[PDB]
């Protein structure tokens, strides 16, 4: 798709879908020979840690989300998958804590 003042393309990295729309700002990177792409992220990487705090809020149960691993020939497309994964964790946890609204009806806070 057409993009902004960047003159580049506006590819939808989030072609597979999620919630909030996502298009990568294609960007030439002279060091890379290829042309590495980034978005609005300040974060270098992101996902979703989970764990069970005790009465002392010591660890009990715990885990963390992990995406299935794409292994496409183009690492660029792989990073499209990565930014997809990012917008994914975004839209989900943001929607959830946005929904946190009335969590208090059975003690959840």
């Amino acid at each position: 798709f057409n993009s902004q003042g960047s003159n580049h393309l506006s590819v939808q990295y989030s072609c597979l879908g999620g919630i909030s729309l996502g298009l990568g700002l294609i960007r030439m990177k002279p060091e890379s020979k290829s042309f590495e792409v980034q978005s609005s992220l300040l974060y270098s990487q992101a996902a979703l840690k989970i764990s069970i705090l005790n009465k002392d809020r010591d660890e009990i149960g715990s885990s963390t989300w992990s995406w299935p691993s794409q292994n496409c020939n183009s690492v660029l497309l792989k990073d499209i998958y990565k930014l997809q994964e990012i917008l994914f964790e975004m839209d989900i946890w943001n929607s959830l804590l946005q929904e946190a609204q009335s969590c208090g009806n059975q003690g959840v806070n």
């Binding site: 057409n2 989030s14 879908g17 909030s20 299935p68």
Partner: protein, 98 residues
Amino acid sequence: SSDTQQVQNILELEAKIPDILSSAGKCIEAIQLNNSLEDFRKYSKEFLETVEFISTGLRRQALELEKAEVPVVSLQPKKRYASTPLSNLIFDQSSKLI
């Protein structure tokens, strides 16, 4: 040509233009330096071809783009949710998540 192939045709059409300037500097060289009418007699039968034939190739890439009739407006996507490969692959992860 289909998909990228028209664009690819332009991509290898890319280098077809800059050397036309070599042919043209030589068009000047024909009398400025080489001092022979025969040279530009040939390159006027070359420069105009190397330029214009590419120009026609371009104008036909565009007019036949206008035959292919690709829409110019970008659709505003609905907030897409889940394509099937995404869904079942997430299920594959769920197996991995077991």
